Amino acid sequence: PLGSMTQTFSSKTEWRVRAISAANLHLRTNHIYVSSDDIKETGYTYILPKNVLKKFICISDLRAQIAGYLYGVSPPDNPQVKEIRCIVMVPQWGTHQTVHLPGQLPQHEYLKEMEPLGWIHTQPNESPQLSPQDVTTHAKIMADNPSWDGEKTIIITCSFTPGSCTLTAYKLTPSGYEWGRQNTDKGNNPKGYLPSHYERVQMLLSDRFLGFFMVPAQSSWNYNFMGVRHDPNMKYELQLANPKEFYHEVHRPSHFLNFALL
Amino acid sequence: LAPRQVLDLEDLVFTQGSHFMANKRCQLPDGSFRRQRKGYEEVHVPALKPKPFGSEEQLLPVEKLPKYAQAGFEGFKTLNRIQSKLYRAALETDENLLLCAPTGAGKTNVALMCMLREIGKHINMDGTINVDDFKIIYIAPMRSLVQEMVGSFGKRLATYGITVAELTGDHQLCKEEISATQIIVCTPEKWDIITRKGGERTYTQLVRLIILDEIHLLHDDRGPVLEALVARAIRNIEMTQEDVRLIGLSATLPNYEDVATFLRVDPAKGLFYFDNSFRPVPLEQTYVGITEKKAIKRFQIMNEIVYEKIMEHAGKNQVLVFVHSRKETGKTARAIRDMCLEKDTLGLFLREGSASTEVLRTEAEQCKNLELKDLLPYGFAIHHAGMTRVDRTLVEDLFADKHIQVLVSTATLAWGVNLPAHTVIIKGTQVYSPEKGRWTELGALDILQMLGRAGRPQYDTKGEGILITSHGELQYYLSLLNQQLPIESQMVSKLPDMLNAEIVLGNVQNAKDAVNWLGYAYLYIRMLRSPTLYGISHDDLKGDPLLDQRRLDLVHTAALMLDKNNLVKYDKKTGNFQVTELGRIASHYYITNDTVQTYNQLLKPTLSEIELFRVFSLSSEFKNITVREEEKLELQKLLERVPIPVKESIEEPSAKINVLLQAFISQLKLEGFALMADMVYVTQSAGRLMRAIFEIVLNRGWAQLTDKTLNLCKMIDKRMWQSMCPLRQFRKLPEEVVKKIEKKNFPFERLYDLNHNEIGELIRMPKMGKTIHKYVHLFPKLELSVHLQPITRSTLKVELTITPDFQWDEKVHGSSEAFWILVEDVDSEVILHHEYFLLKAKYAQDEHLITFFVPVFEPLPPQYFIRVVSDRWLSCETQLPVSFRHLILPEKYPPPTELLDLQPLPVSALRNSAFESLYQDKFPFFNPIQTQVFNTVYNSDDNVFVGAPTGSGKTICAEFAILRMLLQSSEGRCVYITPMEALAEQVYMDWYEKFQDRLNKKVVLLTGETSTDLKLLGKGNIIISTPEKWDILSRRWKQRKNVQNINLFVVDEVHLIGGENGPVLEVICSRMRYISSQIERPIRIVALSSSLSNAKDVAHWLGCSATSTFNFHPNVRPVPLELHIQGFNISHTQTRLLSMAKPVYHAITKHSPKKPVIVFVPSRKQTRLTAIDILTTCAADIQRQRFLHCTEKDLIPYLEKLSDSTLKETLLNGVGYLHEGLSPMERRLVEQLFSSGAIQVVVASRSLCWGMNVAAHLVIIMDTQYYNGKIHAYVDYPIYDVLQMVGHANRPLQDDEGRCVIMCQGSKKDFFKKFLYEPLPVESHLDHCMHDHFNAEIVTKTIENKQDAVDYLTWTFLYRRMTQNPNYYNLQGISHRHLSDHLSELVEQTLSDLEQSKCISIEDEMDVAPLNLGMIAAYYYINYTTIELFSMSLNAKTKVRGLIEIISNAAEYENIPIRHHEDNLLRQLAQKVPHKLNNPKFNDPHVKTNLLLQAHLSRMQLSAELQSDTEEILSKAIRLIQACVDVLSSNGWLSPALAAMELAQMVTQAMWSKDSYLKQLPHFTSEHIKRCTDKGVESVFDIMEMEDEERNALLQLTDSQIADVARFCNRYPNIELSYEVVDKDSIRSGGPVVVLVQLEREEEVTGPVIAPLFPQKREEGWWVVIGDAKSNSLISIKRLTLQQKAKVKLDFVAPATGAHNYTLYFMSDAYMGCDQEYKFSVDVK
């Protein structure tokens, strides 16, 4: 029946609860874990420093994936171990399944003597299998950039487990690179996607050395609130500085200016 | 003390505050009646009659006043009734006054008479008088009243040269006001926070008069602030015994006797009470009490009460209606006006076709206000602070001219404007208090001020005041306005916050101090005379007559509350208070103690912007804020759009405060009336609240939260978010274009790349091309450079160069621009270092250098970060990454020389009875260090380096080399170099008794004077000197044998090469290597130093064998050193020093209760304070005179020879202190009592750590910083000073060990651990002092070309370190070709600078040769920059005036500090001189010496110890005068040369060329110079020509004193001149001409030169000058040192033919009146 009632609608936006939840991400850096032996020995041991790993966790979002390019070298006489020495944040936006990085790779003088070791990204849920989107994205980067060798570049996923963070690092197989560079299906079960397309590598966290960050020279890296101005063909340059948190003021200018408009 | 009991402070709180009605009944005057009306009652009180002139009351005219004060009463013919009864007590007495009179009686002028008496205490004779000698503080209750009286007092006292100004908003540096002003007008809260921040860079100690206007504010909630100000000022009187006059002005209200006792006012002298009858205009009072409870009916009932009373004056009298808000002012003005139209009663306001109806309508046409044009033509108007400034005066000007008939305003007009009206209506007495979160009654001051405007003392016979309020508040306002509302104290509410303020200031250190301080509060006096009102029975008062136990319980309750919130550390048994950094911030930022507890609990480094706002939400200043049901709808519509999310729900008041803060930054006007008031109160206090959070998290090192907090401080001040383009911070720029840029998304940092006509095509505009381009380059921007200088592998020295890349404009930047230098680590989480940088406007285009130290670890980090953020500008930051990828670290220092476990060597090892007799009475055997080097120094000639800690006995090892020199040749010449003059004086005293008194050698001490040093060098076997003192002599070594015939060269404390004056020490020692290699056979060099990490570099530089190098490290000291480094958290220096006072005492009882102790303090003032401090804490434990180990009566033989106040008191209790201000006799008396064991503790300042002849068992270093007077910043102790202070904790034959406690700031704790437990790494800095030495080597022909300059640089220590640590000297490689390039550029730039100053010549870019200007600078040891302007300024007609102004601007005088507490001493000394000056600038370190030079020539003795400033100026004046003499005579100038040659003798005897030449004989007076009236005596030669039995009969002096007069005449230059011209017949023009001049003296060789007013002992120098009249043509000049008989040969050239008459001059540089003048004639053929 009604005609008996008045109830006016209220607004509740997507980022309010996610921003409040992003402020408590520092408690997960005290509990970081890496998967261990499950026929994972590759021929390359990757060592990730904790300082840039903890910072990469707190500047992230628990649902929107963020990514960072890996750079590093090898110890004096041990070509089998790769020390990750730098993480580069580039203009990006993403969802819960993949990220959207520009076509251009990081290019700077500081990284000229280092070799690219792949990329690292956060994942909402822990997965026993490598993401098929990660298989597709990693292979398409190999196709456009011969700098990335299939036996030297890896995909490190930072899984958001309750109370902690689980790390696991995969690499692509020759069969995975050929299927990834052709894949146009973005679903969770694309066709041709096999567990044969990837194998897991070993990863070790260390405190004996420290890494550094490189962020865009002008604007910042987070574009999830400015996705219109993000373009796959966009060009960018880097600087030697640390990245800002996901919900920093400079990442969402429309929230601050539209509220000020009368 | 006794058993305490905790009280409930809030239970003793008067909740009504200002509305508290202590009196319970109210008696009304005669004739008062009440009427009953429509649900409301009225009360009428008739106007009182003035009391008949009873006593001797005659209105005093201004002509009777003291005349100096008549200028302040321009425009008044006669004082009124109350001012005539006060003028004698105000102008002719210093008594504290308390004046109660009704508002309008004229209390202000009485306060002006008190100010005029103080101004007359510091007046001069030149009309314009000393404004640097006093300060007056006028405390007014309201902001508007302050601003008005600043101009009011400014014009009344403009004829006195007085500056009256209101303090700025926030001036943590912009406090240039106080020192410039003399009358400070402020609010109680303003003067409370300034005196809270108790740094004695203040000017509050200059306050001689404090005026407390409207002191009946004590009854108000703001009352306790007045109690805190008076208690702080009165208690501080007895802690200093400098009287401060207190003047209180009050309304006529009860308890005025208690206010008087609280102000220390004698009732029989300073108490003056006048009732409401003394109101100049009688006031007919009418009160309307409404009883209606419903809001809507009561709203219109009073809307009818206003109109009924408006009509009773409509047309007859103006009516001024007061309302609470600035929105009801228009509604009420309309509710009245619009309702008269219903009754047609507006024609009675104005007379229709009047003369004022046309002026009211016409001024409304150009009124510019819509809610004023609507009401102005009809006679209505409004007034409030939220509208125009010039329309308010339009409202005031019309009402003053009797044009406006109804004016509806608020309390602002009543306070800041003197606008009386016949009828005043207070429409309602209800106001909304956002602090209390509810509606409440108006304050008592607002009511008294509003009704005080009723009745014009000009036209009106009486005044009619109408007050409308609730019926329940009738008894209150009847008491307030009829002198029956008692003034009570609201102090127990704010007791915790105000006790902590005294704890932070140091005025209260324990509970007993707090009980004493509480006894000065107005609360205490009220508790004594009315204990019932303050919860005190008679079961308590007379069992505690002075309420001593009651005060202790209150203090005990407040201390526990502060201890629970971690502001204070309160020990219940001792009652002692310990200040904290958190407690200081709450005090200095005016934050209640409950708020800083919340900040301490919730502030975390991992805090986001979301929780940061929430922490601000929980401030206890908002404890009363609630969420009303009528606001939750408008607030929830904002919560769904806030940019910073809020976690708490809408109903909790925390969320309401959060949304109101974000809305204020977004500039959103809201509709809720309470919300707008609550938003204002939340953000009016958000400024200091967030500023406190910033200081908390910055001083903790939290880098991320500091950035967020500092940004929020600016987002609140600028009212804008970060994401908004920062161009809107220019208010002259319009919102217009900044969103024209904001909508088109591109970074603001890109518009710098564009230009005028291209910024516009971006934002689609060809109009304002240069406008945006102008403000883009007006935005502050700094560019950062970095020179990384590694010290070790864990300490990095950084030189940050700040280059401004913007343009200044006082319209935008003002006088300064503040920045925060932040050095963050790799992860941008920890602030490794931070300091405050301020860009002054005068240096807005120069580069700024900043030096600091940061730690590093040897898995080298990727990079650190340096951020320079603006302190007020938003989006204003430059971060410079400092990569460590190419940083070359120096190698780890080699291990020390192992201390071989040798057998202790006896004194018999010397095997010389004379030698052994110097040590066998002191110690049995040598220490393990002296035994290792014995064979290498005593039985060898190889160069030896001995590096050992301070106190290792290195002085004897140097004596080992001296004793060997005397064995190989009884005539041995040894030069001992020590860096500090204080050390040279001590070593000379010790070595004069050993080598000269016992073994009969010659020990000399260089004086810094050439005429004496060159001869002491030749006749002495041991020469003691300082670096610069030996640099002057060893330069001319090629022409002096006594410099190169050295047998042994000893340099002590050679680790001071890395110090400030290091390069001079490095130059002289490296010269000794060059001389010894070029000479026949080598000269022995022995080097002593503290433990050096790179000791092998000094050995290789000084040519010491590896086996002869003894590099010991601090772990091998003979007496074990127990070092303790306590860290202190407090960043405020004065508050940190307080936190160290008690720990200083506690360290004494723990480490050395019985054995002597030395405490080092940063300043002279701190010596006396810490000594007193140590005493009373020793007295608090009931242990007085425990530091006195001699009986009390065996000290007066030493104790009455003193001249100090407290030094006698402290020495009687076993504690002394040393500082520069004490006389040399006083220091010896304190040092003797300390070493004799009498007194156990002595407190010495840092400046004396090099000249102290005592040693203790424990050395306490209280703080490691001192204040620099020039740069106005604190300076860290040099590491060499700390090493020297620690070395005083060494008594080898008295204590088994040595202990030292170092108290420092936490940021310096790790620095001292790395440079005290390990050896010290020293570097060179000669590359920054190359010019003065390169010039000397070119004059002496050591450097003849550019290749020779590189060869000279290779002998230095500067070069050895350029390969061990290249980055310290800006080098990217230790390559050999890298060194030549660096050495060459250092050579090229140094030789080019000397050639630009015309000091040297450069031919074919290779060869260099010295010029005459360079030969003079090197001869007299003068900076090349000084001698450059020593040719720009001098000329041919210079004389005694131009000379002094030139020599004062020398670079050698840009070192002594400046005191601007002196500025008016020099203001008058600029005319105490008989010699005129033109330029102002009295901070100039050269002009202050120009007056100081003439102060010496005027015998103006006593300058506290500025006397020593002159003594160091005279130490360089002679060499500067002789420089001009050479410069002027070289240019052929006769008069300025001769005038300068007799200024040398003017500064020698401290006189002029005008005074008689008899002021030289001792005990001569400047008065009985004219006692030689016409007796024929004005030369010294006349005094000896009279008989001995006669000549004592005119001076009238002692037979003790004429022997001093005789000693001078026995040494007065008695001579005999004989001159001849060789071959005065055959003279052709252009041929060799020669004139010899023989000078035969009598005897002389009788000591040096008699000059008691000169510090040094000079030798008689002489000049032989030939000239030609005063044509200013000097033709010959020669210097000579006469001993008895000596001739001088002068050659010149003959000019043309004819007959020229030449003049011969024989002048000296010491005595006046001995300048001979002979005349001869030459016939040239």
Ligand SMILES: CNc1ccccc1C(=O)O[C@H]1[C@@H](O)[C@H](n2cnc3c(N)ncnc32)O[C@@H]1COP(=O)(O)OP(=O)(O)O
């Ligand atoms: C238009 N008013 C003035 C015209 C000429 C000179 C002075 C004034 C004026 O400003 O009025 C002031 C006093 O100068 C003026 N006044 C003071 N002394 C005299 C005086 N001796 N003769 C005439 N007017 C005087 O009274 C007024 C209020 O005095 P106040 O200091 O505020 O009393 P209180 O509320 O207790 O603080």
Ligand SMILES: [Mg+2]
């Ligand atoms: Mg007044």
Ligand SMILES: [Mg+2]
């Ligand atoms: Mg020594």
